[PDB]
Design a protein around this ligand. Structure first.
Ligand SMILES: [Zn+2]
Lengths: 69, 45, 304, 98, 244, 46, 103, 41, 47, 47, 24, 172, 49, 57
């Protein structure tokens, strides 16, 4: 679903870094290792929270019962 | 206003009495209840 | 023999870096039981402000109500504690939330469709499709419209993505934010990591000059070992930079000519922040909690 | 099926297949093990229900009929005979056992 | 308490009640898992609460867990410590284990409380260190000696026992004698302690204290050791890695 | 939330009572009634 | 006024006649103060035995036990320890105040 | 002082000392009847 | 070995489902014993 | 074979003496093994 | 047999607390 | 459970306050006992632990298809070489401190990143307690039932266990 | 302890024992009636003569 | 909140198992530390759980 607000192990706020992360991969064409280190994630517990997130909310939102089609 | 939602075309709707369970716009027989402004409380945990 | 004057002469603080969010510093000549207590209180006993009760009026989004209430509680608010008092969880709800205990946040988002020209991005395609933590509005209840007018309540990270919407869906809630400690729930913990490490000690035993120093350079982080000549041959430049990886112990050239120990009374604290307080200030606030934690036992009658 | 591989370094696909054969031979024996000893013990306990030690040390049934004249030939509790013939232990601990 | 397929009578024993806050399941010691054939993976146990003093007196004197130490099948012990406590006694009773005075006195009070009635003296007595001059230090075998000194009754002599370990002398280096376990007047003088001593195993130290001092003392030594090796594991952990 | 049935005594009032453990019935002031049998059965369409 | 007589409690079953050996029980405590207080009491040259203990993790109770050699009761040695731990946090606060202002 | 006590249920204990370790005795060949099928005879 | 997770490719396919034949074609060949078997009741040789 | 043995006892006019532990649990009498293999009697002081 | 591909371009990414990429 | 048949019940939720912490400052999310390894021999979990920590550092993902590696190309050497280039221990260990006492643990602890799974079946409808309550009309015995507030059955084998103790009053 | 069992407070305030009231346990049994059916070292019924 | 695995097979992607996340990546320590984790038992972090670890409906 949506990005976790905090990291499970450390407790850093991580939820503000998911849209920043997808732009470092798309626009700047960084690899995942450089993109996580420019976001300021450097404990590997805090790295895997953004590195490994699936983001299924984009797949749930297509099933909207409140709008036509 | 107590309301419902057509399950096929998402058209809002309400039924009272001597009123068939159908969509007025299409004819869909399945209606799902909408949620209105009503208080529920949660602990943020 | 031990004393309080004998502790004041030997104790040292060396502050490495200080910032608005993290702070590295050293505590020299203190015991592990005291320094573990400072690490303890910063995670668990320094209070902070976070949303506790959430009152949904409507939530027609994909995210469950109890999931969305959980996400609001984890949002670090930039409220200063000591502006609030503590709630009293026994007397009931008609008397419990006053304006001196509680900070009210509200959220009222509706999603509509945007009429656009073009598989397109949903910022250009829906209106208020994403809900952020900056959409939480501070409602200054009661007489504290004038004491929070100097600096109002804002989330310390305003781009926390709380929910995503599609048109027709809305979220209307109202969260009461209360003061609490991190032993109760981790949302009240004011620190992203309060932790320490103990100073690494790298004891070279035999002189390992020459090309047996060039490969002794590489078994450590780069600033740790230095070289001059056969004189000032291989020495520790900075024994603070070393991560204790023990990489030199898996080479048989150096398994006799080095040791890896610790300096046992020299601690390296790394205190971060969730946002509400500067990290040098929740170290003071920790060392004063432990002091008052002993005053309240000294000034207390020994029962039976 | 002689696996020269070890679990540290991993096993080859031929000897991976033979090791799955030895992993299923124990699980199929439990699969033939539905109800074995539940009725053996019920038959013993229904007959030997009332057999008890009497005050004259004879082993009798509840109606009174004698089964043995002394329990095991020697009238010793099994849960008390463990240091019975541990004489060197009992000699080292003479004053505490006394 | 009974685990439900009740094969033998030690699967239905008498426990003492300890009411624990904040918990939602029944909660049992590891020393009781051999008698119930219990693993903690979704098993249930029934809890019967008897209702007069005739049935309280039987469940405290005839069916209690202290009188079920030896099984009636062959007279073997069925109660003892299990996994981390075995692997902590090989570390604590080792020869590298040295403890200073603040460490030594903390490990004794971590396992023995006089307020819960563990001591037989009302005051915790200790021992002189085995190293006096360069720094005063205690030894890890000398902690096993102290906890036998405080829970065994004062007006009896100590235990005398020559047993073995499971661990061969070659694993400790040249000329070691750490396979012979020697108790002399209640002082552990030689050898580490294993599953062969405080596991569910015959002729060890726990089975010897059951014979000399009785079933109440051997049940208390299994509790005192279990808290000693729990608090020693927390201060000094045990791990298994890839390099092993 | 009280359900009917027979009358009540315990020196107060003919009315409906308060069952305590769904087959043991008490009064409204804390006096006990006798033996509700609580007809239940198990299911082994079969 | 009226103080809080539920916090610290001398367990009288383990307290000697002299008062030189006692046990205490503190509510809502754990390893945080009990390890820091055991360190400061063991710097008294009159304490013969000291250790803290947590009976069960699920209740928040802290037993500490003091045994002195004599000439000072275990209540006198508990409050010398709490006083020397108040004083020890004033030293850490002063060195950390002086060194932020020294940057 | 190691004698069996009068009133001891030695008939139950004997049946439980065969019926309990027979549950251990339920596996395959490591000729003559073995295990539980021999014990049932 | 290198075996990447396709993080931009996943999020593009979540937001924008394909308008052609499906991705993940091995997943439809897992139930080809069931679907093809039922399809032979009406389609194929001899009606 | 419950009623099979029951017929064998009715034709026999048998007096069940209530001493096996299965016969004592049926009639609710105290068992005769262990703590029920003796009686307890209170010694009263006055004549 | 081809070897398992060693990933190329791997750098120092664990620095001690308070330190960052100050190593040049 | 992990992906190796290492299932386990959550026995206690342990506070971060007194859970062990590393040089990095990390408290682990899950503690698994090393005594669950020698009899299970699930060595795929040990190599997943150092493969997953190597991937969290470098931001890469690792292939764990079987038979990629070799006896001359052991993955403890492969993913160990990646931990050494990051600056961690080659063997996967981490220097780690005690949460309770604050002292350094004796040996470096094997910590890593393992993918975990939550099983669906849970322990809600498992406990029950009855002091008294409903009976049956024929026998006047406690009724059966989890949600009918029903009794616990002292069966045939427990009757034999209460005679074997010689406890005639617990049987009564 | 090894001879003990850890009983949840859910079970603990439900299972009861009919203690007869005497001159030595009236100190305990007063506080048990005062605590009532919710505070744990309490009671849930009294039986008259 | 599922996560994709860091350590996965190549066929994880081919069957499209990322549309159906089955678990989560956990920092696991192989340590005997607490005394509450033996024979089948593990120990969860409490503050991880309060931050949403392993939550489901
Ligand atoms: Zn009444």
């Amino acid at each position: 679903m949506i990005v976790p607000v905090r990291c499970f192990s450390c407790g850093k706020v991580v939820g503000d870094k998911w849209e920043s992360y997808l732009n470092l991969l798309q626009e700047d064409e960084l690899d995942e290792g450089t993109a996580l280190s420019r976001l300021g994630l450097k404990r590997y517990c805090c790295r895997r929270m953004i590195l490994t997130h699936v983001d299924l909310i984009e797949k749930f939102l297509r099933y909207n019962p409140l709008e036509k089609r | 206003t107590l309301k419902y939602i057509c399950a096929e075309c998402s058209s809002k709707l309400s039924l009272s009495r001597t009123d068939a369970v159908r969509c007025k716009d299409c004819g869909h027989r399945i209606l799902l209840k909408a949620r209105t402004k009503r208080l529920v409380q949660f602990e943020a945990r | 023999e031990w004393n309080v004057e004998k502790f004041k002469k030997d104790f040292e603080v060396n502050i490495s870096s200080l910032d608005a969010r993290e702070a590295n510093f050293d505590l020299i000549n203190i015991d592990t039981s005291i320094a573990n207590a400072f690490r303890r209180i910063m995670i668990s006993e320094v209070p902070s402000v976070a949303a506790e009760y959430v009152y949904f009026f409507n939530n027609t989004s994909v995210i469950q109500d109890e999931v969305l209430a959980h996400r609001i509680g984890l949002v670090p608010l930039k409220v200063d504690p000591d502006m609030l008092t503590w709630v009293d969880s026994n007397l009931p709800d008609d008397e419990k939330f006053t304006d001196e205990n509680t900070i009210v946040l509200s959220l009222n988002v509706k999603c509509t469709r945007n009429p656009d020209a073009p598989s397109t991005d949903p910022k250009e395609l829906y209106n208020n499709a994403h809900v952020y933590a900056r959409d939480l509005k501070f409602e200054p209840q009661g007489r504290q419209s004038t004491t929070f007018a100097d600096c109002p309540v804002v989330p310390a990270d305003p781009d926390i993505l709380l929910a995503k919407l599609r048109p027709g869906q809305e979220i209307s809630l109202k969260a009461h934010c209360i003061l609490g400690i991190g032993g109760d729930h981790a949302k009240f913990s004011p620190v992203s990591t309060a932790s320490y490490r103990l100073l690494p000690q790298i004891n070279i035993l035999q002189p390992i000059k020459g090309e047996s120093a060039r490969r002794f350079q590489k078994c450590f982080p780069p600033g740790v070992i230095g070289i001059d000549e056969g004189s000032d041959e291989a020495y520790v430049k900075d024994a603070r930079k070393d991560t204790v990886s023990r990489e030199v112990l898996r080479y048989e050239e150096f398994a006799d000519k080095v040791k890896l120990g610790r300096v046992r009374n020299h601690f390296i604290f790394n205190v971060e922040s969730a946002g509400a307080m500067t990290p040098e200030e929740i170290f003071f606030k920790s060392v004063r909690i432990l002091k008052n934690k002993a005053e309240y036992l000294k000034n207390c009658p020994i029962t039976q | 099926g002689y696996v020269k591989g070890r679990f540290y370094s991993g096993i080859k696909p031929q000897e991976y297949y033979f090791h799955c054969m030895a992993g299923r031979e124990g699980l199929i024996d439990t699969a033939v093990k539905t109800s074995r000893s539940g009725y053996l013990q019920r038959c013993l306990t229904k007959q030997l229900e009332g057999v008890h030690v009497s005050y004259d040390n004879s082993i009798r049934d509840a109606d009174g009929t004698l089964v043995q004249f002394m329990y095991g030939g020697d009238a010793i509790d099994i849960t008390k005979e463990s240091h019975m013939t541990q004489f060197e232990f009992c000699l080292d601990n003479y004053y505490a056992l006394l | 308490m009974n685990r439900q397929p009740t094969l033998h009578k030690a699967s239905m024993m008498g426990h003492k009640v300890r009411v624990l806050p904040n918990e939602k399941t029944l909660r049992l010691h590891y020393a009781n898992t051999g008698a119930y054939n219990a693993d903690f993976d979704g098993d249930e146990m029934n809890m019967h609460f008897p209702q007069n003093e005739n049935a309280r007196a039987e469940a405290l004197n005839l069916a209690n867990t202290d009188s079920q130490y030896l099984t009636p099948t062959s007279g073997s012990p069925v109660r003892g410590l299990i996994q981390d406590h075995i692997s902590a006694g090989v570390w604590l009773t080792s020869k590298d284990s040295f403890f200073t005075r603040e460490q030594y006195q903390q490990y004794i009070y971590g396992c023995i409380r006089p307020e819960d009635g563990h001591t037989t003296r009302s005051k915790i007595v200790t021992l002189p260190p085995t190293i006096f001059k360069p720094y005063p230090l205690w030894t890890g075998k000398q902690i096993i000696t102290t906890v036998l000194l405080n829970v065994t009754p004062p007006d009896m002599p100590g235990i005398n026992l020559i047993s073995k370990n499971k661990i061969k002398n070659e694993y400790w280096g040249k000329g070691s004698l750490e396979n012979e376990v020697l108790f002399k007047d209640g002082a552990l003088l030689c050898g580490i302690l294993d599953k062969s001593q405080y596991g569910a195993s015959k002729y060890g130290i726990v089975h010897s204290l059951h014979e000399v001092y009785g079933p109440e003392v051997a049940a208390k030594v299994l509790s005192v050791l279990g808290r000693l090796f729990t608090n020693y594991i927390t201060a000094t952990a045990f791990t298994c890695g890839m390099d092993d | 939330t009280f359900i009917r049935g027979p009358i009540c005594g315990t020196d107060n009032c003919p009315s409906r009572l308060w069952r305590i453990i769904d087959g043991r019935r008490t009064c409204q002031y804390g006096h006990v009634m006798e033996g509700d049998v609580e007809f239940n059965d198990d299911e082994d369409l079969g | 006024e009226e103080p809080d007589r539920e916090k610290i409690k001398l367990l009288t079953q383990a307290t000697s006649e002299d008062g030189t050996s006692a046990s205490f029980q503190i509510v809502e405590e754990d390893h945080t103060l009990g390890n820091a207080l055991r360190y400061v009491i063991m710097k008294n040259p009159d304490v013969e035995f000291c250790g803290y203990s947590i009976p069960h993790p699920s209740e928040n109770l802290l037993n500490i036990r003091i045994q002195t050699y004599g000439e000072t009761t275990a209540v006198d040695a508990l409050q010398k320890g709490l006083k020397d731990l108040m004083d020890l946090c004033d030293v850490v606060e002063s060195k950390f105040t002086e060194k932020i202002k020294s940057m | 002082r190691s004698l069996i006590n009068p009133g001891e249920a030695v008939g139950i204990i004997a049946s439980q000392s065969v019926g309990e370790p027979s549950t251990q005795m339920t596996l395959n060949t490591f000729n003559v009847t073995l295990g539980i099928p021999r014990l049932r005879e | 070995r290198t075996a990447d997770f396709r993080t931009l490719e996943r999020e593009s396919r979540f937001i924008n489902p394909p308008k052609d034949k499906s991705a993940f074609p091995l997943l439809q060949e897992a139930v080809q014993p069931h679907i093809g078997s039922f399809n032979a009741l009406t389609e194929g040789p001899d009606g | 074979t419950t009623c099979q043995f029951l017929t064998k006892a009715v034709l026999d006019n048998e007096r069940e003496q209530l001493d096996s532990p299965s016969a004592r649990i049926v009639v609710g009498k105290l068992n005769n093994v262990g703590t029920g293999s003796f009686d307890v009697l209170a010694k009263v002081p006055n004549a | 047999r081809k070897d398992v591909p060693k990933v190329e371009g791997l750098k120092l990414e664990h620095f001690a607390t308070g330190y960052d990429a100050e190593d040049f | 459970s992990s992906r190796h048949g290492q299932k386990g019940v959550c026995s206690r939720k342990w506070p971060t306050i007194d859970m062990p912490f590393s040089e990095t400052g990390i408290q682990p999310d899950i503690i698994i006992n090393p005594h669950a390894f020698p009899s299970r021999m699930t060595i795929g979990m040990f190599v997943e632990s150092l493969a997953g920590k190597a991937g969290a550092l470098h931001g890469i993902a690792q292939d764990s298809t079987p038979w990629i590696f070799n006896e001359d190309d052991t993955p403890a050497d492969y993913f160990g070489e990646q931990l050494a280039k990051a600056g961690y221990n080659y063997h996967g260990n981490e220097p780690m401190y005690s949460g309770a006492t604050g002292e350094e643990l004796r040996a470096d602890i094997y910590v890593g990143v393992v993918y975990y799974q939550r099983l669906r079946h849970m322990v809600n409808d498992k406990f029950q307690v009855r002091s008294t309550g409903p009976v049956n009309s024929l026998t006047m015995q406690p009724v059966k039932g989890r949600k009918r507030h029903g009794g616990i059955r002292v069966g045939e084998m427990e009757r034999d266990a209460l005679i074997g103790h010689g406890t005639s009053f617990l049987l009564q | 302890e090894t001879n003990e069992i850890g009983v949840p407070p859910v079970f603990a305030v439900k299972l009861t024992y009919p203690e007869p009231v005497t001159a030595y346990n009236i100190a305990e049994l007063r506080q048990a009636v005062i605590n009532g059916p919710d505070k744990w070292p309490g009671a849930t019924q009294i039986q008259n003569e | 909140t599922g996560q994709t695995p860091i350590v996965k097979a190549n066929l994880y992607d081919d069957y499209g198992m990322d549309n159906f996340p089955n678990g989560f990546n956990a920092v696991v320590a192989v340590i005997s530390y607490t005394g509450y984790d033996m024979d089948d038992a593990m120990i969860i972090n409490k503050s991880a759980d309060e931050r949403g670890f392993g939550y489901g409906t």
